[PDB]
Amino acid sequence: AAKDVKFGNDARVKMLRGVNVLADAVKVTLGPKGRNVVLDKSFGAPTITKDGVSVAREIELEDKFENMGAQMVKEVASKANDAAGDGTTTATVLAQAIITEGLKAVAAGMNPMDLKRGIDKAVTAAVEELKALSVPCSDSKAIAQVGTISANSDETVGKLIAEAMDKVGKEGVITVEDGTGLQDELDVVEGMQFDRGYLSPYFINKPETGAVELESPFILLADKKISNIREMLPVLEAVAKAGKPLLIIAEDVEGEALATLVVNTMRGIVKVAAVKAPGFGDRRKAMLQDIATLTGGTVISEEIGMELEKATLEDLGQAKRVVINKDTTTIIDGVGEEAAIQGRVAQIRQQIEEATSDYDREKLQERVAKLAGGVAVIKVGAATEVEMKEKKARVEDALHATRAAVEEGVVAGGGVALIRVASKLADLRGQNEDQNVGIKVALRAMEAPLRQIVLNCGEEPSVVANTVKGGDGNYGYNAATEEYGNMIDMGILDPTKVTRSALQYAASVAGLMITTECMVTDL
Amino acid sequence: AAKDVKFGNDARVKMLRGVNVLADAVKVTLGPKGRNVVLDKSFGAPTITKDGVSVAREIELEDKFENMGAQMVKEVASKANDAAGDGTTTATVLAQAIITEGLKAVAAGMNPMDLKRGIDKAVTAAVEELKALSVPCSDSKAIAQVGTISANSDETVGKLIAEAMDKVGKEGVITVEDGTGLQDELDVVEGMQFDRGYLSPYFINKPETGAVELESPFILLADKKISNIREMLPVLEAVAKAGKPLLIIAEDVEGEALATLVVNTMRGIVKVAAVKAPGFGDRRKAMLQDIATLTGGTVISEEIGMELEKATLEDLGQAKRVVINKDTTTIIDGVGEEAAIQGRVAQIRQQIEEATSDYDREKLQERVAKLAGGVAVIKVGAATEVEMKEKKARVEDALHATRAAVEEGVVAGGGVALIRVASKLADLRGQNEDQNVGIKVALRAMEAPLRQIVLNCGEEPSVVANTVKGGDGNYGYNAATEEYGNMIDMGILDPTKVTRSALQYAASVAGLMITTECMVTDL
Amino acid sequence: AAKDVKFGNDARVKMLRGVNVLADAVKVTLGPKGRNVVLDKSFGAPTITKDGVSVAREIELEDKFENMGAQMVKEVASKANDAAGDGTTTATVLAQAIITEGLKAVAAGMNPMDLKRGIDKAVTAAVEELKALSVPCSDSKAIAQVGTISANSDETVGKLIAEAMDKVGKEGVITVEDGTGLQDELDVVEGMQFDRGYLSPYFINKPETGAVELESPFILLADKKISNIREMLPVLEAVAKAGKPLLIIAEDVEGEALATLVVNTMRGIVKVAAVKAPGFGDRRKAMLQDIATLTGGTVISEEIGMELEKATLEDLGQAKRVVINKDTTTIIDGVGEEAAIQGRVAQIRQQIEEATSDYDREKLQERVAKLAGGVAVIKVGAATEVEMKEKKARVEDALHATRAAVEEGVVAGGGVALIRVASKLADLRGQNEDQNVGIKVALRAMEAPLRQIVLNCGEEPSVVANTVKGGDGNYGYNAATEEYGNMIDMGILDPTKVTRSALQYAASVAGLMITTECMVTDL
Numbered sequence A, B, C: 001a002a003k004d005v006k007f008g009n010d011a012r013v014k015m016l017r018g019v020n021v022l023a024d025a026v027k028v029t030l031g032p033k034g035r036n037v038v039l040d041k042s043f044g045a046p047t048i049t050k051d052g053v054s055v056a057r058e059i060e061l062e063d064k065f066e067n068m069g070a071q072m073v074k075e076v077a078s079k080a081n082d083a084a085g086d087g088t089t090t091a092t093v094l095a096q097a098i099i100t101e102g103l104k105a106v107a108a109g110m111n112p113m114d115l116k117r118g119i120d121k122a123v124t125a126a127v128e129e130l131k132a133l134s135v136p137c138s139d140s141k142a143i144a145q146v147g148t149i150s151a152n153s154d155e156t157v158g159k160l161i162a163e164a165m166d167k168v169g170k171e172g173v174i175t176v177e178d179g180t181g182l183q184d185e186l187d188v189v190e191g192m193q194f195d196r197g198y199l200s201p202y203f204i205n206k207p208e209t210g211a212v213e214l215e216s217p218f219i220l221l222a223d224k225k226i227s228n229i230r231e232m233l234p235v236l237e238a239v240a241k242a243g244k245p246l247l248i249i250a251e252d253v254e255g256e257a258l259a260t261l262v263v264n265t266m267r268g269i270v271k272v273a274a275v276k277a278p279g280f281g282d283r284r285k286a287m288l289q290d291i292a293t294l295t296g297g298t299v300i301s302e303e304i305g306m307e308l309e310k311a312t313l314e315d316l317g318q319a320k321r322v323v324i325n326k327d328t329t330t331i332i333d334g335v336g337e338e339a340a341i342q343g344r345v346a347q348i349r350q351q352i353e354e355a356t357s358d359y360d361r362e363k364l365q366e367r368v369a370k371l372a373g374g375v376a377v378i379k380v381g382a383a384t385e386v387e388m389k390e391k392k393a394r395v396e397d398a399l400h401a402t403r404a405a406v407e408e409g410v411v412a413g414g415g416v417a418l419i420r421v422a423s424k425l426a427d428l429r430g431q432n433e434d435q436n437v438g439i440k441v442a443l444r445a446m447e448a449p450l451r452q453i454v455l456n457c458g459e460e461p462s463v464v465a466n467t468v469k470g471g472d473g474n475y476g477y478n479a480a481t482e483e484y485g486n487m488i489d490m491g492i493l494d495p496t497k498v499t500r501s502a503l504q505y506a507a508s509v510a511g512l513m514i515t516t517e518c519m520v521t522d523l
């Protein structure tokens, strides 16, 4: 197609207009006084959300150059959501601030590559200062506070996440699902969790979360992969006459002759998904046997000789809920037999008593941790479906932030940590003047989250920013109560990973964005 | 697609405009003096209805932001219809009042999230006050009055519902369907009822009620889960030559090889449906045997060896009417043999006498209650099809309200109960001024049902609202007779569940709606 | 014509949009860091100006309701220019701030008439506090500083105005006119001034300043008004021979048979003007004789018997420059014998030495002061005509501000005085809550000039406003040097009359404007 080509300042102002549209839409949601955004879905009711990445993902502009700017800066929130699950609004605000100040510097006639290098140096130094400024969440013991802050000042959600991490361990697996009542419920049930994903992007359910949910699925287990398709036809026919979705945890499946011909088979009545199995060799068969014992199923094998044609539905496993995601697939509740589960736990405990080699010992301890800890499940309570989606998003953000806090630590929330690390970087210099100006651009942009948090409250961002910069340490401004204090003491804690990731992704995209002289799009 | 993005007050007034359009169209139907709405159907005659959820579901607007507001506020009536089957107009009126007053508060600079928190606190307290204010319907014995009020002051419908609850029990199963004469008839007929639904959303008939109906279907029973189709294909041919539509009762059926195959089979001449079987193991076998004995059919099993290829038409069961709904599937009339039904009842009563375990005793007495009570069927009498649909909707509302009244209790109707709980909540306070204003918004919005009822009468809502607020207890205003008095004495009784659910759903959706600052839709 | 009629919030937001357009255009010119505005003139080159009233007068919008808002706010700058000649930008900024905050209060549901009453009470108390806070310019002796501040930090203009006030007296008459060189010159020249204006609105010359200028005019004097204009037709032809514009100083002249016939005669080549004579009886004859002795002319009278037909051009007087304005008509250099002027001055001095009546003595002191002081003419030096107009506007503003300072006093500039009076009015209360909110609206708007000055500097207005409010007395913010200090010491002095007038006119118009509910215009 014929291309529209824009050069220099006209292109940059159109790109900034697109970034400004996306970033305003995202930034109205920042902080405790941040408001909600309604996203239109032609497939049903609109979704009300405070999540920055959802608003960012929905944004697309009519103007092609402004749309290019919007997609460029939407990458920031996408990466922030994918890496930490929180801070997408903060990442978008930081990216917009860097883009605005860097374009102001480019309009002042300075080299944007050196501006990008200065921004990169300042952000590397600020990541180091964030690591130094971080406080371990085990020492502080504020998992509930992190979850409360990340759930938009919801003490119930944070306390529930803290209880779940107390039940299954801070390294345990917690899954959020839609509840049935109007109140949030937590149950510690028996289920598995593996870092495995689907082999086909067309297996995604109607939700756009990327993780398909199965209502009482049917588990199929096989450590070997038979070449012929026709031998699998009796099993597929038995599952089709059954009414539980088929999840296959076998040793990697292709869509050349199974998923494609199934796409032409049904129109999407009941979803069937297959995923890999973590590990290999004896370890893979061991965990496959563990899954089969959990769900009451069996594992076929060449040595056993039990062929899939002779397998029945009663021989196969059964579960109550399975969430399949690219990052991690979890089995929420496989019934099986509780006595069988306890016996397998005792047998694997005897195995770890017998085992002595370090790798086998550590994988066996991972197995016993997965079996004993189980899975915590949070059923979100909400009177309606729109409230359900909003609260579930908040609970998922709280879970991600608590995970990031136990993984990497915490810093002062409310944008105070970025203010402190920018104050600590006031003497950082580059190789020339443009690099120094890029450093100053990054350091000024580090104040943007706090300023936007204050602006959402209706207060004056500059006065509060100056008052916070005057203070030292964890001194900042509770926007919920509109008063200053030690942000750790008042429980406004950000994950260190969330802040670091937001800063890094905003910096990378925005520093690349300020270096553009020409933009080429369609007409 | 390119997105239109609106911010702040412009977005909020567009959203309020859409909510106002939907809520006006719904609110014209509120109360005894409420009028009817004609909904256009491209297929067949238009539908005249006084039901709030039908008018709400038909609403869709040209403006995308107004349509988005309409969809969110339509979720209120959808949830109210799904949860109680009544009060959708009251729920819409409450939601519109909360949205209006909350948007007025947001225009006054008040924090909308704390306004939502205040509304939530006030509505939780009001639900507690409604539970306290509730009077049991067994003590009052006004099931006929509840049905009469819920059928728009139709004494005959309420008396018919009361007679049905007297015949089959207040826990008995009552189904409403089209009659043949001009008068409404009650028939206590033998039939079954289970809390199970269709496994495919594509089995829905041309009516949009969600519950398909079968005109003299053919009942098929199966317990063992066979694999192949070609062994069951002769049964499909036998039913497809027998002439009556097929209803299969089994544990669980997918749609990869059956539902899509049956979709590709015919163009929609005769419907074939399958349903789930509640319980498992011996209990499922027991209920399948009961269904087979009721319809004269037989249940296949692996132990019996009654292979489906040998099954004939006389061996299978037959019924006169079956209603398949997601919440509950009922068999209105299975002929079978009356002597066989009585013998099975005597045998299961002997099982009652023999059994001693609490779970077996309770499930077996549930079985004998289902068998002895039977199904009450209400033949709606109307001279035309449009009157048939309107009266059937009114009788369905009456049935739902009587069920809610026996389940949860009754309160003073005409919006009096919400007025009383608002008066009782006058001293409720929140954490800050925003939360207090949200509480006051909810309390003023709880006067809206009574005011709309009065406005539909052509009277002055403020005068009647003040007069009712002056009174105490069940003192309210009969809008049918346009005079004040004790609401319980005049028989104006609302279900407690209906009022509580309407308030809760209106509050949740409206409080979420008032917190929106940006709105994103298509162009 | 058919009328468009808007009601309530739609009309108010249209009004506010028009106000915002006009006020943004005016407010870009506020302070020492304020920029210029180009006003397009079809009749020649565009005008570059920093004067708020010129930008305000040029503004007219396509939208009719926005145009009404713009016109009503433009009234503020027009009144401020007419009353003090300075502070029009400050008046516009104050009016816009009052309108914005008052419309916010009106949108909060408050009675706008009570808001207007509160604003009026706050502004009355504030002008009382400004009178209390005022420091006499005689005690301070900072006329040069006031002129420098009012000329946009031009030391030369302020020094020239101070020298002119030192030469002809602070009550003396100073006129600004276009020079011929590139530098500003001060000339003390024998001339008169009277508090009289032109009798016809059609006498305005090509400049739209409202004051016409005459290049070497011809002065005619007349104490009595003859019946027919045809007697002076020989004098009219004698004037029409010599190309000097005719300025007639008489008691009073109509335009039925003199102005209209001369407009029917002349097409706009050379202007003939007339003025009124202050005083009556002997005083008018005395001042006419004084003017005649200045210009070397003669005064006609009935007792003298000197008829205009016998009068010649040499008998009549003439001048070098005459400026005719509605408020005051000035004669710059009447062409007459200096020795005759000195002899007349001595004779009049002997007249005070003889007279004893208080009214006669005071009018004779006025006469000798007018004669001896003379007129101080400032020739503005600029390389081009656009720079000439800009500098002449700045010098006129400086002259007006110095006159206002010697009349009413000075206060701290930079919006500091309004900040101090708003701080001193923090305990002012009205008759109800809406009046208190109006008072608070006025007090918040009193911060607007300083905030707009700082925003024009590119700094943060909130931080500087808070820092100034923290200080006491004349402590404020030198915006030229970007640093705080005592602004009386730093030389940033505002006239008390200028600040008081700006506040009063902004308050009157804006308080009336917030009370609108319907707007009626054309289609």
Ligand SMILES: Nc1ncnc2c1ncn2[C@@H]1O[C@H](COP(=O)(O)OP(=O)(O)OP(=O)(O)O)[C@@H](O)[C@H]1O
Pocket (backbone or CB within 6 Å): A029, A030, A031, A032, A034, A050, A051, A052, A053, A085, A086, A087, A088, A089, A090, A091, A149, A150, A152, A153, A397, A412, A413, A414, A415, A449, A453, A477, A478, A479, A480, A481, A492, A493, A494
């Ligand atoms: N009470 C509070 N006072 C001050 N700052 C707060 C308070 N509660 C939370 N914050 C801060 O607000 C930010 C979180 O806002 P928000 O959750 O809306 O955005 P986010 O975490 O950047 O991203 P997302 O939209 O994905 O949740 C963090 O910087 C957090 O420290």
Ligand SMILES: Nc1ncnc2c1ncn2[C@@H]1O[C@H](COP(=O)(O)OP(=O)(O)OP(=O)(O)O)[C@@H](O)[C@H]1O
Pocket (backbone or CB within 6 Å): B029, B030, B031, B032, B034, B050, B051, B052, B053, B085, B086, B087, B088, B089, B090, B091, B149, B150, B152, B153, B397, B412, B413, B414, B415, B449, B453, B477, B478, B479, B480, B481, B492, B493, B494
């Ligand atoms: N005679 C009456 N006098 C006063 N109020 C009455 C009378 N009859 C019914 N009502 C009240 O009118 C309301 C019922 O109106 P209506 O049935 O039209 O709407 P709904 O129950 O909210 O929902 P839906 O449209 O789904 O039926 C209840 O609040 C009921 O108490």
Ligand SMILES: Nc1ncnc2c1ncn2[C@@H]1O[C@H](COP(=O)(O)OP(=O)(O)OP(=O)(O)O)[C@@H](O)[C@H]1O
Pocket (backbone or CB within 6 Å): C029, C030, C031, C032, C034, C050, C051, C052, C053, C085, C086, C087, C088, C089, C090, C091, C149, C150, C152, C153, C397, C412, C413, C414, C415, C449, C453, C477, C478, C479, C480, C481, C492, C493, C494
């Ligand atoms: N160096 C300075 N520092 C701070 N404030 C200053 C300084 N110089 C002038 N000001 C202030 O700026 C204002 C004058 O601005 P400006 O002359 O542009 O507008 P104005 O007086 O409102 O009217 P106009 O547009 O008619 O001149 C006064 O409040 C004056 O005290």
Ligand SMILES: [K+]
Pocket (backbone or CB within 6 Å): A029, A030, A031, A034, A050, A051, A052, A089
């Ligand atoms: K957010």
Ligand SMILES: [K+]
Pocket (backbone or CB within 6 Å): B029, B030, B031, B034, B050, B051, B052, B089
């Ligand atoms: K209704």
Ligand SMILES: [K+]
Pocket (backbone or CB within 6 Å): C029, C030, C031, C034, C050, C051, C052, C089
């Ligand atoms: K100005």
Ligand SMILES: [Mg+2]
Pocket (backbone or CB within 6 Å): A086, A087, A149, A150, A151, A397
């Ligand atoms: Mg967050």
Ligand SMILES: [Mg+2]
Pocket (backbone or CB within 6 Å): B086, B087, B149, B150, B151, B397
């Ligand atoms: Mg009803």
Ligand SMILES: [Mg+2]
Pocket (backbone or CB within 6 Å): C086, C087, C150, C151, C397
């Ligand atoms: Mg000025």
